[PDB]
Design a protein around this motif. Sequence first.
Motif, PDB file in Angstrom:
ATOM      1  N   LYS A  25       0.827  -1.201   0.000  1.00 36.73           N
ATOM      2  CA  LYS A  25       0.000   0.000   0.000  1.00 36.73           C
ATOM      3  C   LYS A  25       0.865   1.256   0.000  1.00 36.73           C
ATOM      4  O   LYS A  25       2.039   1.214   0.368  1.00 36.73           O
ATOM      5  N   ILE A  27       1.435   4.801   1.626  1.00 39.26           N
ATOM      6  CA  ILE A  27       1.131   5.669   2.757  1.00 39.26           C
ATOM      7  C   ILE A  27       1.572   7.103   2.485  1.00 39.26           C
ATOM      8  O   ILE A  27       0.968   8.053   2.981  1.00 39.26           O
ATOM      9  N   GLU A  32      -0.161   8.725  -2.327  1.00 38.64           N
ATOM     10  CA  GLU A  32      -0.646   8.465  -0.977  1.00 38.64           C
ATOM     11  C   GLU A  32      -2.129   8.102  -0.993  1.00 38.64           C
ATOM     12  O   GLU A  32      -2.979   8.933  -1.309  1.00 38.64           O
ATOM     13  N   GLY A  33      -2.430   6.854  -0.648  1.00 41.52           N
ATOM     14  CA  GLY A  33      -3.810   6.403  -0.629  1.00 41.52           C
ATOM     15  C   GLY A  33      -4.095   5.366  -1.698  1.00 41.52           C
ATOM     16  O   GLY A  33      -5.241   4.955  -1.883  1.00 41.52           O
ATOM     17  N   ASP A  34      -3.052   4.944  -2.404  1.00 36.87           N
ATOM     18  CA  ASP A  34      -3.196   3.950  -3.461  1.00 36.87           C
ATOM     19  C   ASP A  34      -2.551   2.628  -3.055  1.00 36.87           C
ATOM     20  O   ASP A  34      -1.618   2.600  -2.252  1.00 36.87           O
ATOM     21  N   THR A  35      -3.055   1.533  -3.615  1.00 37.45           N
ATOM     22  CA  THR A  35      -2.531   0.208  -3.310  1.00 37.45           C
ATOM     23  C   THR A  35      -2.406  -0.638  -4.572  1.00 37.45           C
ATOM     24  O   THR A  35      -2.986  -0.314  -5.608  1.00 37.45           O
ATOM     25  N   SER A  50      -1.061  -1.172 -10.141  1.00 35.91           N
ATOM     26  CA  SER A  50      -2.297  -0.680  -9.544  1.00 35.91           C
ATOM     27  C   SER A  50      -3.504  -1.444 -10.082  1.00 35.91           C
ATOM     28  O   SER A  50      -3.483  -1.944 -11.207  1.00 35.91           O
TER      29      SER A  50
END
Length: 69
Positions: A25, A27, A32-35, A50
Amino acid sequence: GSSGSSGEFPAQELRKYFKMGDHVKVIAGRFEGDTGLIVRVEENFVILFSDLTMHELKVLPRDLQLCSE
């Protein structure tokens, strides 16, 4: 074998070091906020695929974090 999730993986090596096949993930960074999953790894950064944009994101292992670990 037939369609499924669990595969013949008699070797369960749990290592923090972001390795291919493992999920990570984001952070921090510009994502920031993507996995996503790990498709490529380098001594500099780690490339994770992604699932939202369906593309390859390039970020450092200092701003990422495993999910299973």
